[PDB]
Short mmCIF file of all heavy atoms in Angstrom, two decimals:
data_model
loop_
_atom_site.label_atom_id
_atom_site.label_comp_id
_atom_site.label_asym_id
_atom_site.label_seq_id
_atom_site.Cartn_x
_atom_site.Cartn_y
_atom_site.Cartn_z
N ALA A 73 -23.06 8.07 0.73
CA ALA A 73 -22.78 9.47 0.93
C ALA A 73 -21.49 9.92 0.26
O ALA A 73 -20.43 9.34 0.47
CB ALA A 73 -22.72 9.78 2.41
N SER A 74 -21.61 10.94 -0.57
CA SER A 74 -20.46 11.53 -1.24
C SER A 74 -19.89 12.60 -0.32
O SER A 74 -18.74 13.01 -0.44
CB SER A 74 -20.88 12.13 -2.58
OG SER A 74 -21.70 11.24 -3.32
N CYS A 75 -20.74 13.04 0.61
CA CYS A 75 -20.39 14.05 1.59
C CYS A 75 -19.38 13.50 2.59
O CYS A 75 -19.69 12.57 3.34
CB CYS A 75 -21.65 14.50 2.32
SG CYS A 75 -21.36 15.63 3.70
N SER A 76 -18.18 14.07 2.60
CA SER A 76 -17.13 13.64 3.51
C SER A 76 -17.57 13.78 4.97
O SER A 76 -17.11 13.05 5.84
CB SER A 76 -15.86 14.46 3.26
OG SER A 76 -15.60 14.56 1.87
N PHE A 77 -18.47 14.72 5.22
CA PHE A 77 -18.97 14.97 6.56
C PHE A 77 -19.94 13.87 6.99
O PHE A 77 -19.70 13.18 7.98
CB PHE A 77 -19.65 16.34 6.62
CG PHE A 77 -20.21 16.68 7.97
CD1 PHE A 77 -19.36 16.94 9.04
CD2 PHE A 77 -21.58 16.76 8.18
CE1 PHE A 77 -19.87 17.25 10.28
CE2 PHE A 77 -22.09 17.07 9.42
CZ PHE A 77 -21.24 17.31 10.47
N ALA A 78 -21.02 13.71 6.23
CA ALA A 78 -22.04 12.70 6.53
C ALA A 78 -21.44 11.30 6.52
O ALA A 78 -21.83 10.45 7.33
CB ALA A 78 -23.18 12.80 5.53
N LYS A 79 -20.51 11.05 5.61
CA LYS A 79 -19.87 9.75 5.50
C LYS A 79 -19.15 9.41 6.80
O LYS A 79 -19.30 8.31 7.33
CB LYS A 79 -18.87 9.73 4.33
CG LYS A 79 -18.14 8.41 4.16
CD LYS A 79 -17.26 8.42 2.93
CE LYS A 79 -16.47 7.13 2.80
NZ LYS A 79 -15.33 7.07 3.75
N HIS A 80 -18.40 10.37 7.33
CA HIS A 80 -17.66 10.16 8.57
C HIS A 80 -18.61 9.93 9.74
O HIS A 80 -18.28 9.22 10.69
CB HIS A 80 -16.75 11.36 8.86
CG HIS A 80 -15.86 11.15 10.04
ND1 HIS A 80 -15.02 10.07 10.17
CD2 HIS A 80 -15.69 11.90 11.16
CE1 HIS A 80 -14.37 10.15 11.31
NE2 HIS A 80 -14.75 11.25 11.93
N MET A 81 -19.78 10.55 9.68
CA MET A 81 -20.78 10.40 10.73
C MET A 81 -21.30 8.97 10.74
O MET A 81 -21.56 8.39 11.80
CB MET A 81 -21.93 11.39 10.52
CG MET A 81 -21.50 12.84 10.61
SD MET A 81 -22.89 13.98 10.71
CE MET A 81 -23.79 13.28 12.09
N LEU A 82 -21.44 8.40 9.54
CA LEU A 82 -21.90 7.04 9.39
C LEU A 82 -20.82 6.06 9.84
O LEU A 82 -21.12 4.98 10.35
CB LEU A 82 -22.29 6.77 7.93
CG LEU A 82 -23.50 7.57 7.43
CD1 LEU A 82 -23.48 7.67 5.91
CD2 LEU A 82 -24.79 6.93 7.90
N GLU A 83 -19.56 6.45 9.64
CA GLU A 83 -18.42 5.63 10.05
C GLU A 83 -18.37 5.54 11.57
O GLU A 83 -18.03 4.51 12.15
CB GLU A 83 -17.10 6.23 9.54
CG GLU A 83 -17.02 6.38 8.03
CD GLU A 83 -15.92 7.34 7.61
OE1 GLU A 83 -15.32 8.01 8.48
OE2 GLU A 83 -15.64 7.43 6.39
N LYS A 84 -18.73 6.65 12.21
CA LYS A 84 -18.75 6.74 13.67
C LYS A 84 -19.87 5.90 14.26
O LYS A 84 -19.65 5.10 15.17
CB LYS A 84 -18.93 8.19 14.11
CG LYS A 84 -17.63 8.91 14.41
CD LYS A 84 -17.83 9.94 15.51
CE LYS A 84 -17.92 9.28 16.88
NZ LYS A 84 -18.42 10.22 17.92
N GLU A 85 -21.07 6.08 13.73
CA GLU A 85 -22.22 5.35 14.22
C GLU A 85 -22.34 4.00 13.53
O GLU A 85 -22.90 3.88 12.45
CB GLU A 85 -23.50 6.16 14.00
CG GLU A 85 -24.22 6.52 15.29
CD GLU A 85 -23.46 7.52 16.14
OE1 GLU A 85 -23.63 8.74 15.92
OE2 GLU A 85 -22.69 7.10 17.02
N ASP A 86 -21.79 2.97 14.18
CA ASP A 86 -21.82 1.62 13.64
C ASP A 86 -23.26 1.14 13.46
O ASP A 86 -23.55 0.31 12.61
CB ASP A 86 -21.06 0.66 14.56
CG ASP A 86 -20.99 -0.75 14.00
OD1 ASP A 86 -20.06 -1.04 13.22
OD2 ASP A 86 -21.86 -1.57 14.34
N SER A 87 -24.15 1.70 14.26
CA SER A 87 -25.56 1.36 14.22
C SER A 87 -26.19 1.74 12.87
O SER A 87 -27.17 1.13 12.45
CB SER A 87 -26.28 2.08 15.35
OG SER A 87 -25.46 3.10 15.89
N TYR A 88 -25.61 2.72 12.20
CA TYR A 88 -26.13 3.19 10.92
C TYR A 88 -25.50 2.43 9.76
O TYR A 88 -25.91 2.58 8.60
CB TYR A 88 -25.86 4.69 10.74
CG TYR A 88 -26.55 5.58 11.76
CD1 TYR A 88 -26.24 6.93 11.88
CD2 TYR A 88 -27.52 5.06 12.61
CE1 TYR A 88 -26.87 7.73 12.81
CE2 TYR A 88 -28.15 5.85 13.54
CZ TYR A 88 -27.79 7.23 13.63
OH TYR A 88 -28.46 7.99 14.56
N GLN A 89 -24.52 1.59 10.06
CA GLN A 89 -23.85 0.80 9.03
C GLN A 89 -24.64 -0.45 8.68
O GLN A 89 -24.08 -1.49 8.35
CB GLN A 89 -22.43 0.44 9.49
CG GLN A 89 -21.38 1.42 8.99
CD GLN A 89 -20.13 1.43 9.84
OE1 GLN A 89 -19.22 0.62 9.63
NE2 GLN A 89 -20.06 2.36 10.78
N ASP A 90 -25.96 -0.33 8.76
CA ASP A 90 -26.86 -1.42 8.41
C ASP A 90 -27.52 -1.11 7.07
O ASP A 90 -27.65 -1.98 6.21
CB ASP A 90 -27.92 -1.62 9.51
CG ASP A 90 -28.88 -0.45 9.63
OD1 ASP A 90 -28.40 0.70 9.74
OD2 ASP A 90 -30.11 -0.68 9.62
N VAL A 91 -27.93 0.14 6.90
CA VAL A 91 -28.54 0.58 5.66
C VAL A 91 -27.51 1.30 4.81
O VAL A 91 -27.65 1.43 3.59
CB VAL A 91 -29.74 1.52 5.90
CG1 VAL A 91 -30.96 0.73 6.35
CG2 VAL A 91 -29.40 2.59 6.93
N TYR A 92 -26.45 1.77 5.47
CA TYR A 92 -25.37 2.45 4.79
C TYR A 92 -24.38 1.42 4.27
O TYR A 92 -24.04 0.47 4.97
CB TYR A 92 -24.69 3.44 5.76
CG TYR A 92 -23.33 3.92 5.30
CD1 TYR A 92 -23.17 4.59 4.09
CD2 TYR A 92 -22.20 3.72 6.09
CE1 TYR A 92 -21.93 5.03 3.68
CE2 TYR A 92 -20.95 4.16 5.68
CZ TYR A 92 -20.83 4.82 4.47
OH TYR A 92 -19.60 5.26 4.06
N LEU A 93 -23.92 1.61 3.04
CA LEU A 93 -22.98 0.69 2.42
C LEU A 93 -21.57 0.89 2.96
O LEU A 93 -20.63 1.18 2.21
CB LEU A 93 -22.99 0.84 0.89
CG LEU A 93 -24.34 0.56 0.22
CD1 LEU A 93 -24.20 0.64 -1.29
CD2 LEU A 93 -24.86 -0.81 0.63
N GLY A 94 -21.42 0.74 4.27
CA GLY A 94 -20.12 0.88 4.90
C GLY A 94 -19.38 -0.44 4.86
O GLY A 94 -18.17 -0.50 5.07
N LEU A 95 -20.13 -1.49 4.60
CA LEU A 95 -19.58 -2.83 4.50
C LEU A 95 -19.28 -3.16 3.05
O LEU A 95 -20.10 -3.76 2.35
CB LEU A 95 -20.56 -3.87 5.08
CG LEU A 95 -21.95 -3.33 5.47
CD1 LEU A 95 -22.82 -3.15 4.24
CD2 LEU A 95 -22.61 -4.27 6.46
N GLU A 96 -18.13 -2.72 2.58
CA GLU A 96 -17.74 -2.97 1.20
C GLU A 96 -16.94 -4.25 1.08
O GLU A 96 -17.30 -5.14 0.31
CB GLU A 96 -16.97 -1.77 0.61
CG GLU A 96 -16.36 -0.84 1.65
CD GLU A 96 -15.12 -1.42 2.28
OE1 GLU A 96 -14.01 -1.16 1.77
OE2 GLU A 96 -15.23 -2.11 3.31
N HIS A 97 -15.86 -4.36 1.86
CA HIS A 97 -15.01 -5.55 1.83
C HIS A 97 -13.84 -5.45 2.82
O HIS A 97 -13.42 -6.47 3.38
CB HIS A 97 -14.46 -5.80 0.42
CG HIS A 97 -13.56 -4.72 -0.10
ND1 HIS A 97 -12.19 -4.74 0.05
CD2 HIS A 97 -13.84 -3.58 -0.77
CE1 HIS A 97 -11.67 -3.66 -0.50
NE2 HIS A 97 -12.66 -2.93 -1.00
N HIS A 98 -13.33 -4.25 3.04
CA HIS A 98 -12.18 -4.08 3.93
C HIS A 98 -12.59 -3.62 5.33
O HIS A 98 -11.97 -4.03 6.31
CB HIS A 98 -11.12 -3.16 3.27
CG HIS A 98 -11.09 -1.72 3.72
ND1 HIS A 98 -12.03 -0.79 3.35
CD2 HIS A 98 -10.18 -1.05 4.47
CE1 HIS A 98 -11.71 0.39 3.85
NE2 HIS A 98 -10.59 0.26 4.53
N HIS A 99 -13.63 -2.79 5.42
CA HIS A 99 -14.12 -2.30 6.72
C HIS A 99 -13.04 -1.55 7.50
O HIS A 99 -11.96 -1.27 6.98
CB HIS A 99 -14.62 -3.47 7.57
CG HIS A 99 -16.10 -3.67 7.53
ND1 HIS A 99 -16.68 -4.82 7.05
CD2 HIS A 99 -17.12 -2.88 7.95
CE1 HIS A 99 -17.99 -4.73 7.17
NE2 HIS A 99 -18.28 -3.56 7.71
#
């Protein structure tokens, strides 16, 4: 997500950090 809004929503919902590339390296 390039969207600062949607991105933050994904950051909040750890459950969505499975398909979302929230796991880059630093977390």
Side-chain angles (χ1 to χ4, degrees):
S74 314
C75 174
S76 315
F77 180 69
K79 179 175 177 285
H80 186 54
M81 297 192 54
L82 294 158
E83 301 162 352
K84 264 212 76 193
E85 242 69 87
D86 184 87
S87 15
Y88 297 169
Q89 265 157 86
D90 66 309
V91 284
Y92 164 59
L93 299 184
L95 7 78
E96 20 76 91
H97 64 92
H98 100 286
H99 262 118

